[PDB]
Amino acid sequence: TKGTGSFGKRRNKTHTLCIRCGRRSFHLQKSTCSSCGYPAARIRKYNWSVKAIRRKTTGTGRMRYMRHVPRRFKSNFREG
Amino acid sequence: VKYSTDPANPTKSAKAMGRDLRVHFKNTRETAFALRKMSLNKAKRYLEDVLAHKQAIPFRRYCRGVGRTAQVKNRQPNGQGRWPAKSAKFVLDLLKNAESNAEVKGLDVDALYISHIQVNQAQKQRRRTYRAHGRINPYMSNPCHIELILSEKEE
Amino acid sequence: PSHKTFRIKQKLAKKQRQNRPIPYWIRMRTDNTIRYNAKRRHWRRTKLGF
Amino acid sequence: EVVTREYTVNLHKRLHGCTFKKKAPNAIKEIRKFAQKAMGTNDVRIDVKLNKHIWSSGIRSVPRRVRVRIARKRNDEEDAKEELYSLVTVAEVPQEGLKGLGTKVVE
Amino acid sequence: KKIKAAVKKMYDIQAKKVNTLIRPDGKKKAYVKLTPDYDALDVANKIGII
Amino acid sequence: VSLKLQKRLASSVLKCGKGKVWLDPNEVNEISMANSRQNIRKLVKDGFIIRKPQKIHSRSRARRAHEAKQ
RNA sequence: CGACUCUCGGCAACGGAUAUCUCGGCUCUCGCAUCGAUGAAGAACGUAGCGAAAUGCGAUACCUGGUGUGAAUUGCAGAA
RNA sequence: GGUGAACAGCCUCUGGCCAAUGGAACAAUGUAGGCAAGGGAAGUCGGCAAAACGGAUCCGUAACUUCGGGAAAAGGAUUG
RNA sequence: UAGGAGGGCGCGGCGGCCGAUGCAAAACCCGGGGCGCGAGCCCGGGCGGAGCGGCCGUCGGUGCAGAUCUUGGUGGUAGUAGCAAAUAUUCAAAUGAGAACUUUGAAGGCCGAAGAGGAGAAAGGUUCCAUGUGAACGGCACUUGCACAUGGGUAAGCCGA
Ligand SMILES: [Mg+2]
Numbered sequence: 001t002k003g004t005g006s007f008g009k010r011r012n013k014t015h016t017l018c019i020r021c022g023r024r025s026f027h028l029q030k031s032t033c034s035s036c037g038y039p040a041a042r043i044r045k046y047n048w049s050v051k052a053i054r055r056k057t058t059g060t061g062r063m064r065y066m067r068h069v070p071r072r073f074k075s076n077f078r079e080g
Numbered sequence: 081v082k083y084s085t086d087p088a089n090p091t092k093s094a095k096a097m098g099r100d101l102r103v104h105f106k107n108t109r110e111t112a113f114a115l116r117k118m119s120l121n122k123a124k125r126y127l128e129d130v131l132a133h134k135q136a137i138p139f140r141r142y143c144r145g146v147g148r149t150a151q152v153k154n155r156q157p158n159g160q161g162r163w164p165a166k167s168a169k170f171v172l173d174l175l176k177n178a179e180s181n182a183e184v185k186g187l188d189v190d191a192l193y194i195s196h197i198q199v200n201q202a203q204k205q206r207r208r209t210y211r212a213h214g215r216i217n218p219y220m221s222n223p224c225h226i227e228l229i230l231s232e233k234e235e
Numbered sequence: 236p237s238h239k240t241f242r243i244k245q246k247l248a249k250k251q252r253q254n255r256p257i258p259y260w261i262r263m264r265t266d267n268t269i270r271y272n273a274k275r276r277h278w279r280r281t282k283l284g285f
Numbered sequence: 286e287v288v289t290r291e292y293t294v295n296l297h298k299r300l301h302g303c304t305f306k307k308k309a310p311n312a313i314k315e316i317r318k319f320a321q322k323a324m325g326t327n328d329v330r331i332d333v334k335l336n337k338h339i340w341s342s343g344i345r346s347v348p349r350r351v352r353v354r355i356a357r358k359r360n361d362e363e364d365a366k367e368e369l370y371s372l373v374t375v376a377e378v379p380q381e382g383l384k385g386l387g388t389k390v391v392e
Numbered sequence: 393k394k395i396k397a398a399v400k401k402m403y404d405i406q407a408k409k410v411n412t413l414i415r416p417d418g419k420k421k422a423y424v425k426l427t428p429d430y431d432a433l434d435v436a437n438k439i440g441i442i
Numbered sequence: 443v444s445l446k447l448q449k450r451l452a453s454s455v456l457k458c459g460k461g462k463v464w465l466d467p468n469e470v471n472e473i474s475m476a477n478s479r480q481n482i483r484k485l486v487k488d489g490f491i492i493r494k495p496q497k498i499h500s501r502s503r504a505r506r507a508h509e510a511k512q
Numbered sequence: 513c514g515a516c517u518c519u520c521g522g523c524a525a526c527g528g529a530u531a532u533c534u535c536g537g538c539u540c541u542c543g544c545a546u547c548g549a550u551g552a553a554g555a556a557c558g559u560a561g562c563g564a565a566a567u568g569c570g571a572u573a574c575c576u577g578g579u580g581u582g583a584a585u586u587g588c589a590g591a592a
Numbered sequence: 593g594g595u596g597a598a599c600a601g602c603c604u605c606u607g608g609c610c611a612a613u614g615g616a617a618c619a620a621u622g623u624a625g626g627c628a629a630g631g632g633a634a635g636u637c638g639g640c641a642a643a644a645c646g647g648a649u650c651c652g653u654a655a656c657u658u659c660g661g662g663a664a665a666a667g668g669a670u671u672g
Numbered sequence: 673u674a675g676g677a678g679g680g681c682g683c684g685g686c687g688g689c690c691g692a693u694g695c696a697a698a699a700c701c702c703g704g705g706g707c708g709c710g711a712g713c714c715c716g717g718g719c720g721g722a723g724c725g726g727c728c729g730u731c732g733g734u735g736c737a738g739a740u741c742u743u744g745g746u747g748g749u750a751g752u753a754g755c756a757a758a759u760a761u762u763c764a765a766a767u768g769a770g771a772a773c774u775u776u777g778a779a780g781g782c783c784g785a786a787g788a789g790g791a792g793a794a795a796g797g798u799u800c801c802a803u804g805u806g807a808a809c810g811g812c813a814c815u816u817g818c819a820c821a822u823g824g825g826u827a828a829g830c831c832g833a
Pocket residue numbers: 009
């Protein structure tokens with residue numbers, strides 16, 4: 001039936017780990033990530049969910065590069 | 081650390097406490113209420129004779145459903161009583177601990193008696209159980225704090 | 236499964252090293268709040284989902 | 286007082302009506318209860334050969350009379366409850382059968 | 393190939409055969425069998441293992 | 443004394459089933475202090491651990507039934 | 513007399529309200545304009561003598577160099 | 593492995609278990625399973641449920657029929 | 673009653689005024705004494721251990737018994753319904769503070785090979801193995817464990833990809 005009889009057959013994966021976003025949302029058959037839109041060039045982001053815009057906006061990561069840009073702005077991009 | 085009822089005389093009394101004891105509060109309330117004002121030695125004898133299923137602890141306040149027995153006709157005529165083994169055993173551990181404290185002070189153990197015995201609910205411990213139509217329900221124990229005070233009898 | 240991709244083995248390694256109760260000594264560092272490890276995972280309770 | 290006596294346990298009358306999946310366990314319970322009544326000791330130890338004898342015919346048929354010997358002996362254990370116990374074992378039966386065999390006392 | 397080359401440059405020996413496996417905790421572990429010219433006891437005591 | 447490490451390691455060495463290993467009750471001390479397959483093999487060679495004989499399934503009534511069918 | 517039921521009063525529980533706080537939030541105002549093929553945001557894995565997370569950092573990996581300050585770090589141990 | 597037409601059921605060997613909370617008692621009412629004198633559907637909306645038949649060998653097998661079926665029809669006998 | 677208006681009580685600030693405060697403030701409790709028709713207010717006692725009031729003006733997220741109100745807690749219910757399919761357990765011994773549940777041995781039964789046996793694909797992710805264990809968990813129990821802690825473990829020219 002539906003329900004107990006039918007939840008036993010969950011055995012395959014629709015989604016595996018996406019490579020651009022690291023979430024478990026890469027639709028396999030369709031070959032596209034359902035969260036970062038991947039492999040599309042641009043990222044999937046919509047304004048009907050500002051919450052999902054903030055969860056993955058700029059600022060929630062390491063900022064390995066731009067965190068130094070303010071400091072480099074001060075002292076006017078100087079090289080000695 | 082200080083109990084509900086202080087002894088008549090503090091120098092001639094020993095006290096024992098147990099907090100967060102994992103035993104049914106209702107059973108140990110009825111045990112204490114059966115044991116209050118007995119002598120220490122008759123309390124040890126009685127309470128072991130209960131643990132060994134030979135003589136009964138009457139159930140009076142929390143008794144709806146407790147079946148009847150003949151071993152309790154002496155103190156409760158309608159004959160309603162049980163034999164709480166786990167609770168009687170915990171209370172025996174505290175009785176021995178208070179007899180030990182009374183020996184350490186130096187009272188006549190043979191003259192000791194249960195001055196003040198109190199059972200008092202504690203924080204309920206939680207665990208989840210599973211019911212038809214996928215509904216999960218609380219499955220929670222009612223542990224008790226048990227305190228007692230043995231005081232030497234005086235003429 | 237017995238035939239697992241190297242990516243999934245790579246991430247199982249890290250989700251393994253992320254299971255230990257917090258060290259005994261952190262608890263005495265100055266002005267400290269970390270009490271127990273609130274990010275435990277158990278193999279039977281909370282599936283990684285990946 | 287230590288003492289060894291040969292009894293005959295009429296087991297049909299003590300196991301009558303018992304549920305099949307329980308006639309042999311109730312046979313062992315009745316052997317212990319019978320040793321308790323006979324020799325007043327609360328602690329009865331049943332020999333493995335008495336067990337094997339009772340259990341040999343299934344769970345739902347047990348011998349009807351079991352000639353046992355109960356040996357009340359000293360509890361030599363320095364830690365102990367009782368000062369004495371009883372050790373019941375299977376007993377040799379004469380060829381003439383249980384005809385007229387009462388309770389005897391062994392030398 | 394790199395494991396045998398390094399085991400030669402360091403420790404000045406050679407490996408007749410190397411086996412590798414990535415242990416579940418995450419790092420790789422390599423079993424370097426010495427050609428029976430060299431003695432593993434001798435190398436283990438030249439570096440201090442046993 | 444738990445010997446669940448020694449019923450295994452013995453069904454494996456004696457190449458039997460865990461219901462065929464026999465560990466003598468009297469020397470559970472030495473069996474327990476035996477802690478390896480090597481030590482299980484010295485115990486087997488020293489006679490403490492035995493293969494029990496296979497339960498008998500004799501076809502003698504089958505043979506008599508046929509020898510009365512011919 | 514006593515048990516039970518209701519109750520009053522004292523203490524002890526159960527529980528986390530109320531009171532006092534607050535390296536937080538919210539609002540208003542102001543100053544500057546600075547990401548990316550010279551590889552960015554994000555993701556992943558590693559990285560500490562004893563760390564899991566958070567915080568850093570990239571096989572030079574809770575950092576290297578400079579410069580300023582001028583004697584520490586610190587849960588512990590250790591070269592100093 | 594045995595019986596059997598048989599990978600049916602029923603018992604056994606290799607291998608695996610006795611894990612399903614235990615003690616006492618035999619009251620109603622239950623749930624699962626049986627048996628009943630005389631009668632055999634009178635119960636009931638309704639033969640619902642249960643009983644009766646059931647393997648195999650030998651004989652016999654009607655109306656009807658698309659001439660293939662009906663058909664294991666029906667009715668009998670034997671079984672160690 | 674619906675409804676209207678007037679005068680007041682109370683809460684939290686702001687501008688002023690009057691002060692209380694480690695000889696004990698706020699808050700909270702009382703079978704304490706009062707005041708008011710009433711909202712409420714004043715004092716005593718206690719715990720409490722650092723801040724608080726009263727008056728005039730002025731403002732606002734200001735007054736709770738209801739909304740199958742939101743959140744949190746706690747009762748009776750109630751030691752009650754109940755722990756019941758898969759045939760089955762028993763006796764000595766040992767360890768242990770404690771044994772129906774651990775381990776050994778003897779027995780008795782079950783799966784009966786389209787198995788309750790031996791291996792895998794998927795999926796899980798260290799559950800695998802050893803040593804130990806205060807709690808919690810193992811819907812009874814435990815010396816026990818798939819639980820907790822510390823360590824160990826996965827080797828390929830031929831099996832795969
Ligand atoms: Mg399918």
